[PDB]
């Protein structure tokens, strides 16, 4: 309509799924097999969301501790898909492992039996960390991101509560994948995904032509909080204040340029809201309280991540080939 808008495309795996069997991305056509519950004794309920309840369980057959989740047939679509995706991920570094899709004849409803990892909530955890114990998980976390990205998939919801971490042992597993989806070269994607603290700026202007990049802003948000000490860093209010909380960091001007870059009329409102703020040196957040966590690296890596242009951001991999993570000879030396 008068006032066209280019659009975007994945800058990295922009065409992956295509050069692939339809079977693959056609999850609406994915009829997975199921198992009973009976084989599983749901010990203690860890959590649950709007559609899924989540318990700690153990496979009766072989006293093996495991995690299980269930969720009414809200949209056999989501369900259908969530499954295909996960099978399509299994065997992926730091990617939650889907043990087996079973339908607890309990209600005669489907459930997932995920591997079990001993999570310790970032709340307590995100404070004992260290310049090291951070680069370490980020990178780790990343290895996950880049992998699902490499496989044409953008989780669509990055946040602490989806990033378990066994600090004792020392492992990371980006659990969950119920909001994720497939990435095909240009497709208006609901913008109503993610959380009111990570949802990227892009998903504020209701800009659907997003991609893997989204998985990075989030990843961006954590890092900052992890490095500076704010949780969340952009602790927003109205799904709209969440745009200003940012605006004050990336810049009000710098912002428009972005919406100019992609023909975007900023919904009214923000007018009264926004104001005229100017990009803030990330140093404007480094005080005693976090002095030891920061460093030029994180500030560097951080600037190239938390950016408006949902395109000009570091890639899932580039991230890993970035300096800040050098401190990790990534156990693999060859
Ligand atoms: C349940 C999630 C939302 N949060 C949560 C909250 C408290 C806790 C405590 N431990 N814990 C936990 C531990 N191991 C595995 C999973 N798990 C395996 C897959 C999924 C869920 C999935 O992958 O969808 C979760 N969750 C929690 C996990």
UniProtKB/Swiss-Prot annotation:
Residues 40-325 form the Protein kinase domain. The keyword Kinase applies. The modification Phosphotyrosine is found at residue 13. One of its GO terms (cellular component) is acrosomal vesicle. The modification Phosphoserine is found at residues 18, 21, 288. Belongs to the protein kinase superfamily. Ser/Thr protein kinase family. CK2 subfamily. Heterotetramer composed of two catalytic subunits (alpha chain and/or alpha' chain) and two regulatory subunits (beta chains). The tetramer can exist as a combination of 2 alpha/2 beta, 2 alpha'/2 beta or 1 alpha/1 alpha'/2 beta subunits. Also part of a CK2-SPT16-SSRP1 complex composed of SSRP1, SUPT16H, CSNK2A1, CSNK2A2 and CSNK2B, which forms following UV irradiation. Interacts with CSNK2A2IP (via C-terminus). Interacts with SIRT6; preventing CSNK2A2 localization to the nucleus. Interacts with RNPS1. Interacts with HIRIP3. This is Casein kinase II subunit alpha'. It comes from Homo sapiens. The lineage of its organism: Eukaryota, Metazoa, Chordata, Craniata, Vertebrata.
């Amino acid at each position: 309509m008068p006032g066209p808008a280019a659009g975007s495309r994945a800058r990295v795996y922009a065409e992956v799924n295509s050069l692939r069997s339809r079977e693959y991305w056609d999850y609406e056509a994915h009829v997975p097999s199921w198992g009973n519950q009976d084989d599983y004794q749901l010990v203690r309920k860890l959590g649950r969301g709007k559609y899924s309840e989540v318990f700690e369980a153990i496979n009766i057959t072989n006293n093996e501790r495991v995690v299980v989740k269930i969720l009414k047939p809200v949209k056999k679509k989501k369900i259908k898909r969530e499954v295909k995706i996960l099978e399509n991920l299994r065997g992926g570094t730091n990617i939650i492992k889907l043990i087996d899709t079973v339908k607890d004849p309990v209600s005669k409803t489907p459930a997932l039996v995920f591997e079990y990892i001993n999570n310790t909530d970032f709340k307590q955890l995100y404070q004992i960390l260290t310049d090291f114990d951070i680069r370490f998980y980020m990178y780790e976390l990343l290895k996950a991101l880049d992998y699902c990205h490499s496989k044409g998939i953008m989780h669509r919801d990055v946040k602490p509560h989806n990033v378990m971490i066994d600090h004792q042992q020392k492992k990371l597993r980006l659990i969950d994948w119920g909001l994720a989806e497939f990435y095909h070269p240009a497709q208006e994607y609901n913008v109503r995904v993610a959380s009111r603290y990570f949802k990227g700026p892009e998903l504020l202007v209701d800009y659907q032509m997003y991609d893997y990049s989204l998985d990075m802003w989030s990843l961006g948000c954590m890092l900052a909080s992890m490095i500076f000490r704010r949780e969340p860093f952009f602790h927003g209010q109205d799904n709209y204040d969440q745009l200003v909380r940012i605006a004050k960091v990336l810049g009000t001007e710098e912002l428009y340029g972005y919406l100019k870059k992609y023909h975007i009329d900023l919904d009214p409102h923000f007018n009264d809201i926004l104001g005229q703020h100017s990009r803030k040196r990330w140093e404007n957040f480094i005080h005693s309280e976090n002095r030891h966590l920061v460093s030029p690296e994180a500030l560097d890596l951080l600037d190239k991540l938390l950016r408006y242009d949902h395109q000009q951001r570091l890639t899932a991999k580039e991230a890993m080939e970035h300096p800040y993570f050098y401190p990790v000879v990534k156990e693999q030396s060859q």
